[PDB]
Amino acid sequence: SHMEELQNKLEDVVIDRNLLILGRILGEGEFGSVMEGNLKQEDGTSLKVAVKTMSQREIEEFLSEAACMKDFSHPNVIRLLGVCIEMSSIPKPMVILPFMKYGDLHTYLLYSRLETGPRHIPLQTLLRFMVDIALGMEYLSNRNFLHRDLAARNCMLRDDMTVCVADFPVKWIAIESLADRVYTSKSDVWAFGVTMWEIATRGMTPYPGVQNHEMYDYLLHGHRLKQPEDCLDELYEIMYSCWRTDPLDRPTFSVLRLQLERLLESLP
Numbered sequence: 001s002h003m004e005e006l007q008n009k010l011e012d013v014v015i016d017r018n019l020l021i022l023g024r025i026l027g028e029g030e031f032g033s034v035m036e037g038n039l040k041q042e043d044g045t046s047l048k049v050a051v052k053t054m055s056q057r058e059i060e061e062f063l064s065e066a067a068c069m070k071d072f073s074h075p076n077v078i079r080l081l082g083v084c085i086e087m088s089s090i091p092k093p094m095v096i097l098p099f100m101k102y103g104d105l106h107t108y109l110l111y112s113r114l115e116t117g118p119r120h121i122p123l124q125t126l127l128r129f130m131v132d133i134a135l136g137m138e139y140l141s142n143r144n145f146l147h148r149d150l151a152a153r154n155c156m157l158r159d160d161m162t163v164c165v166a167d168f169p170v171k172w173i174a175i176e177s178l179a180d181r182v183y184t185s186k187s188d189v190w191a192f193g194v195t196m197w198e199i200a201t202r203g204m205t206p207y208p209g210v211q212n213h214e215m216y217d218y219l220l221h222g223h224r225l226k227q228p229e230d231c232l233d234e235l236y237e238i239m240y241s242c243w244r245t246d247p248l249d250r251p252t253f254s255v256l257r258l259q260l261e262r263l264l265e266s267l268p
């Protein structure tokens with residue numbers, strides 16, 4: 001039953017606090033922190049992990065949400081390893097995630113433009129990044145899960161260079177979501193088009209010269225993100241279809257993923 005499936009997912013998500021060692025701080029956000037950590041597995045060995053730290057209803061909602069996320073099983077979707085609820089002198093929820101040396105896609109794109117960072121990213125690799133995101137998003141929409149925060153900063157790079165969607169913002173929000181507050185998988189498609197633009201520009205902030213407060217009016221007048229300098233016309237057409245005014249006219253992730261794979265296969 002619906003209850004039975006939720007009770008199953010809930011049983012698997014919690015990790016004992018003593019099976020975890022918190023290390024150095026990797027980042028400090030507005031309402032949380034990311035720390036490197038060690039997780040002791042059921043086979044006796046320890047695994048390198050990343051721990052993201054963050055009222056009974058809010059904790060129960062967090063546990064329910066985390067249990068849903070741990071159930072995601074796709075190579076282009078981040079696999080949540082589990083959660084820990086620590087107690088202060090106030091509950092402190094902790095989410096256990098894979099340790100990924102290459103970090104977030106946004107930082108990786110910016111680093112590639114500097115001599116000491118990773119090498120210049122060729123077109124085939126940038127398109128492969130978009131294919132992976134489309135693959136993860138296709139999986140999420142098919143299981144009717146809304147991302148709500150799709151951007152290059154929330155996409156992670158695995159050790160084999162596979163991109164995976166994670167952390168399920170005005171310049172990434174669809175024209176109808178800014179006004180009516182309504183959100184569909186077609187709003188995620190809009191955010192995907194912006195993410196494709198971030199990848200093509202190698203990490204530029206969307207809409208240069210356009211302030212965040214004037215975004216709704218800019219879009220309402222038909223203006224959209226401009227085509228990047230060495231971007232293929234076919235690739236720009238794919239990302240432009242993501243920003244169609246009517247959400248119904250926007251393609252699904254499944255249509256977008258195949259359009260992207262075909263364009264990638266056509267590259268020498």
Ligand SMILES: C[C@@H]1CN(c2cnc(Nc3cc(F)c(OCC4CC4)c(F)c3)nc2NC2CCOCC2)CCN1
Nearest residue numbers: 026027034050078097098099100101103104154166167
């Ligand atoms: C040695 C260092 C280790 N570091 C690193 C290694 N492993 C993870 N794992 C990880 C961390 C997360 F916070 C995750 O949540 C989703 C986030 C995108 C929002 C996640 F799915 C995996 N994160 C790392 N850094 C992040 C710190 C916070 O800002 C983003 C980069 C890469 C840079 N080099």
